[model samples]
Target: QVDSYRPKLGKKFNEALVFASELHAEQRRKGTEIPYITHLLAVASIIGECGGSEVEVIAGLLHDSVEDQGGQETLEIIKQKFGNEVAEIVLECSDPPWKERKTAYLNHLKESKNQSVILVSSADKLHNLRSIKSDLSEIGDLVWNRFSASKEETIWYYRELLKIYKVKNAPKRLTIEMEEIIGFIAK
Candidate 1:
């Protein structure tokens, strides 16, 4: 699937795929029969369709590698391969410290002047929330509650970020989809 999209993006996509795939080689989706790379590719597609720049698409592909699998080493590789813009966006979107998730996310929005990073981050979470809603039933209420409890700080992080993006005039399609997912979770 990503191979088909590669031509549309040219060489940048190839670089992103290599970095993301290598970094995430041993990772799998949490509680799902899917590789973590699927989520990265899905977010990259969302970035592309939403008019994201090449750097944003690359960041989307590598976003989770730092958070879930590797750290500064992976980020440095991305920086070397794609440059600072892509690496910075992925760093901005990566999950915050376990204890400061909410504050860190909010601070990111407040401090960031790069609209590309904001858009990529918004798209990433919107996709995540949508996926969560889709699989909520199969995952069961127990798992959902536990997941929410474990990441309680991050729940409102998405909510506030969504609100901020709306205020910043983020694309309507992205905002509407994010709101729909928020509504689904709220219910």
Candidate 2:
């Protein structure tokens, strides 16, 4: 479906594919046997479907690489391969492990002026919540409980992002998808 969208990223899309694929090869989704790349692809597809820019889509693909698989090396590779815009967008979404709270990372997004970063980050979180809901049977309530315990913090984070997206005139569909994700998690 993303391929059908045919976002004109010149060569950046190819570079993203290489980096995402390499970093996710040995990783598995949390609490499941699925390949980690599946999550990246889903995030990328969500951004594309919501009419995000090519750079945002690329960021979605590489969103977890720095935190999960690669670090400065991954950031440097992305910068070298795609350019500063793509790398910066991914960096904006990547969480710093030193932070004491999960909400701190979300706060960073709340303060950012880059609409592309907000859109891509929203898409990534939206897709992740959707996956949790859909795979509840497979992942079980322990996963849901873990997530629910942090629900308010997560919602506050996304609400802040929604405010930015609303102000920046992001595609209405992205907001709608985010609302749906919220509702799903709340249920």
Candidate 3:
């Protein structure tokens, strides 16, 4: 998949894939022992399949690099490699620290002006919720214990995000998919 994107998106996306892979290679997701790189690829796939441009797709791949791996230097690298638009979307899609996790995320969405940023953000959330839904079913309610917030609170956050996106003029197909995931959590 990344190969197909290379001819169209150029060498930057290729470099991004390698960079993101290396940056997250040693890390696993919060719950399971699965590689963190897997989540990034999944998010990139979701973004790509949801009619996103190469920048959006690539941003999905590097979304966590600045926040999780490095800071100003990493941000500058992304900007230099993928341009400011891609860097900005990656920054916007990243979460605030757990201290301001809830309110900060909501406020970011509320003030979010770029469609690409919001779109990539939704793709990231959808991937996370999909994983949570799978893990929740497999592990039962104990799944909620893995999160910074409780089960109900986390569900509410996702639902509210769906609502926020619903109010936007975003693409319909991905929005429907995201809502389906959110609705499943409600059940």
Candidate 4:
């Protein structure tokens, strides 16, 4: 089934790929030496695999920029290059301040107007969980200490996200894998 169909890449997606790499050049995944672009690319790929639009894929790639590093100049450039739709999706997915991060973001997702936003969010969360599960297996429980939330909160958050993703139709197969991972830690 996988080999039966192939889609050609377009200039916009290719440009988004390079652009995300440049923006995240100096960054790494938290608690790992791996490049942050890896996360970005994975999110983009998952978004595509889930039948997201080009803008959603681009949003997946740039979701961390404004919240984590990019400035007004960076935001402006993204708007110009990726257009208003992509920029808006980025805005929607940007993380809130640490004080409001979890609650606010989840609340926003509840009333989200864009399916792409939900899709990207789920893809991003899915990949993030996969990484956490990997690190936990490779190391030990110490992996939980790196996060802002307590182990309970962290576990709770993923469980809650599974519910949210279901409401938003993020694809049950992916959510099933997410559930299995969370179920492992919970048990």
Candidate 5:
């Protein structure tokens, strides 16, 4: 007998995919020629692997839109288009400023009771760390130059996120991979 199971994803996901693609159309990865949507796609895939909801996956696709595209106005659009949950997750995931936003985000991750927010945020960071690891292998020390933060600060942030994930009891698969990659990147 064949199973009839189907994932819950549908039209909203497709719309968010196109929206994210359009938002980042002129962007690239920080230090490479790769299209920026690849990062969004990777984050969405990671969210799926960790059992994200349809809204969570869509949030993953548009996580950077608020920051990279239009800030609060774009966030308002997300709210209107995808509803409150996706917009909220994307809001929690965006970085407004460097140290202040990072610190606030860290607190948000640690204190948030919203599972979707935590999962989407974790998926976003995991993809970012993985990309940094891949770029490091190819570019060596030059990879550190691409970021506004120094190497030490970047590693410190990821390590702290790992600690918060452990505290919050994030999914084991994601936390484990994040731990492993942080080790590689920190070394």
Candidate 6:
């Protein structure tokens, strides 16, 4: 039997792409000239590859809009545009202060029974760690300068996340790669 799969991204995905573009119009990745949308797109792609539903993939595209763009107002717009499921996942993905956010996110991951939330959250962090690892290879320890968190804190954050992923039994494929990148950066 031949395996057949088709993506039904449809109208909503397009609208989300546009909306994400508008929200992050002037933003770039930390210390790089690359557009921020690249990260969003990458996360969405990862979610798709992991068999995420249309809602989950769309949520990946807008995950940062709440925290980085407009907060509750942005979240309201997301709910209006994409419906409650996408909005709820994005809300779960949003964060507060650095230490508090990381801790809370880990706790959420630990307790969340929502696979969509776990998948999107893991994909988002996986892409971030992939970038951090790539940048570290290019710039050495200087890569640490780009983050608001210190090297210790950054490594700790990912490590702490790893612990949560373990307990949550988040998709093993993603968590295994996350482990590799975290190990690379921790060194």
lDDT of 3 by residue, 1-187 (tens): 3446336655776788998999889989987799999999998888888788889889999988988898879999888888998898888877655536777888888788888887777888888888878987889777777877767777778877877787766667767887887788777
- Quantify all predictions' global Cα lDDT against the true fold: 0.77, 0.75, 0.82, 0.84, 0.88, 0.88
Model 5 gets an lDDT of 0.88
**lDDT per residue, candidate 4, 1-187, as tens digits?**
2433334446788798999998899999887889999999998998888777787888899988888776667778889999989888888877656536777778899889988788888888999988888888888888887887788888888888899999888787689888998988775
Once model 6 is optimally superposed onto the true structure by TM-score, how far is the C-alpha of residue 182 displaced, in angstroms? 1.2
Model 3: lDDT to the true structure:
0.82
Model 4 regions more than 4 Å off: 1-8, 96-101
TM-score of 1: 0.83
| Model 5 per-residue lDDT tens digits across residues 33-121 | 89999999999998888888899999999988988999999999999999998998888777566878778879978888788877887
Task: Please give the lDDT score at residue 82 for candidate 3.
Answer: 83
For model 6, what is the C-alpha lDDT against the true structure? 0.88
Better of 4 and 5 by lDDT: 5
> Which regions of candidate 2 are displaced past 4 Å?
1-10, 96-100, 137-140, 145-170
Evaluate residue 168 in candidate 3 and report its C-alpha lDDT on the 0 to 100 scale: 66
Each prediction's TM-score against the native? 0.83, 0.79, 0.88, 0.90, 0.91, 0.90
Q: In candidate 5, which residue ranges exceed 4 Å CA deviation?
A: 1-7, 96-101
Best by TM-score: 5
lDDT of 1 by residue, 1-187 (tens): 4456445577877778987887787787776667788888888899899888777788888878778867998788778888988888878777545557666767767677888877777777778887787777676455465354444554666678788888767778898988877777766
lDDT for predicted candidate 4 compared with the true structure: 0.84
In candidate 5, residue 26 scores what lDDT?
A: 94
Which pairs clash in the backbone of model 3? none
